[PDB]
Structure 1
Amino acid sequence: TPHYLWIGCSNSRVPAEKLTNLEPGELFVHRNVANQVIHTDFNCLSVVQYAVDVLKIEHIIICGHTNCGGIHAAMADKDLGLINNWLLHIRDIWFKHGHLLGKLSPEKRADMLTKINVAEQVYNLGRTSIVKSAWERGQKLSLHGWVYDVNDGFLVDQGVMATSRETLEISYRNAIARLSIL
């Protein structure tokens, strides 16, 4: 059985098995554009549920990555059909952290939004009743939100780790605080 859920980007360069060292078959995997955990996405939350409730997975990694098409698209004006809907959530995050991102060098803005996004998705994941329950019923379950850079390993935006709803609060607000340091 798998012990890890990897929520990553569909992006071809970011596959769990090569960013991780996990034994073959340890990785339950969900990938979607910009590694989102939208509150009302049955797709992702079904994986999270199946992971958490069927497989009793104890680690969920939301891995985002740099130079992520989703993030760029989120920030772009292009009509990408359904992607617009999907990335609107990311734009929400973008707008929510507009103070911070406005400051940043336009190019780095994408990479910040990637870091932030992961934070937000973990925050989303961790506020899921799926995860909140796993915890509430004392199941061990750690959420991690990382950002993998194509040319750099993990951005050490480590930030995003929750093992409880409370640690989520701290980690999340903490990560957001860290990222705001500039």
Structure 2
Amino acid sequence: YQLQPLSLDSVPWRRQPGQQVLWIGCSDSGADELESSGLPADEIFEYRSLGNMMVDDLSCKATLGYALDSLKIRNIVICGHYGCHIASGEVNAGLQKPWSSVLDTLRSTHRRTLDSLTGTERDRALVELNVLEQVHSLRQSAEAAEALQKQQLNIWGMVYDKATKRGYQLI
């Protein structure tokens, strides 16, 4: 994967005005992430959750179902963010399963990548890896797979950097 700086005026989830985009972000983003979306506020249908994850739960399934079935959304963005306290470090006791299992699996699957980095750079890699795995996982969902095979859905990953005040697409 590579990180491509977004140009606000040419984001792949806004090829035309006036549509809604399902924006999946993290509860501790704590800054101006939507100012890097390339979308006006009225085009954003926002689901903001622990770790910008979609897990096997009623909320994640109903939100996706409402977006595709009621709003006819054709674009989903999973936005992670540098400095995340949830997709960080090696443990957090107050984070329940399956969120904690997703991060355990990231850390074990990508151990050699993570072990090659230190401290803040490692946490930045874990943010990026979480976005990539959430995008891949969401495409394998039955509801997304059907819409993808009909060419009625795209799922995009990006990471927001509150220090550079920019978003970066995962390509």
1:112 corresponds to which letter in structure 2?
Answer: A
Q: Distance in 2 between matches of 1:61 and 1:120?
A: 13
Determine the C-alpha separation between the residues in 1 that align with 2:31 and 2:154: 21
Percent of aligned pairs with the same amino acid: 30
**Aligned residue pairs, count:** 152
Give the TM-score taking structure 2 as reference length.
Answer: 0.80
Q: Which runs of 5+ in 1 are unaligned?
A: 161-182
- Cα distance in 2 for partners of 1:6, 1:133 equals 20
Deviation per CA, 1:135-178, whole angstroms, max 9, x where unpaired? Answer: 23x25211011011111212x3x225xxxxxxxxxxxxxxxxxx
Question: Deviation at 1:63?
Answer: 0.2
Opposite residue 91 of structure 2, the aligned amino acid is D
Contact 2:33 2:160 in 1 (8 A): no
CA shift in 2, pair 1:6/1:15, >3 Å: farther
* Larger RCO (CA within 8 A; separation ≥ 6): 2
Corresponding residue number in structure 2 for 1:41:
57
Partner of 2:6: none
Taking the aligned partners of 1:159 and 1:95, their CA distance within structure 2 comes to: 21
- Cα drift, residue 52 of structure 1: 1.4
Moved over 3 A (4+): 14-17
Pair 69,79 (structure 1): closer, same or farther in 2 beyond 3 Å: same
Q: TM-score, normalised on structure 1?
A: 0.75
Q: For residue 151 of structure 1, what is the aligned residue in structure 2?
A: 163
8 Å contact from structure 1 (residues 10, 34) kept in 2: yes
Q: What SS does the corresponding residue of 2:41 show, helix, strand or coil?
A: coil
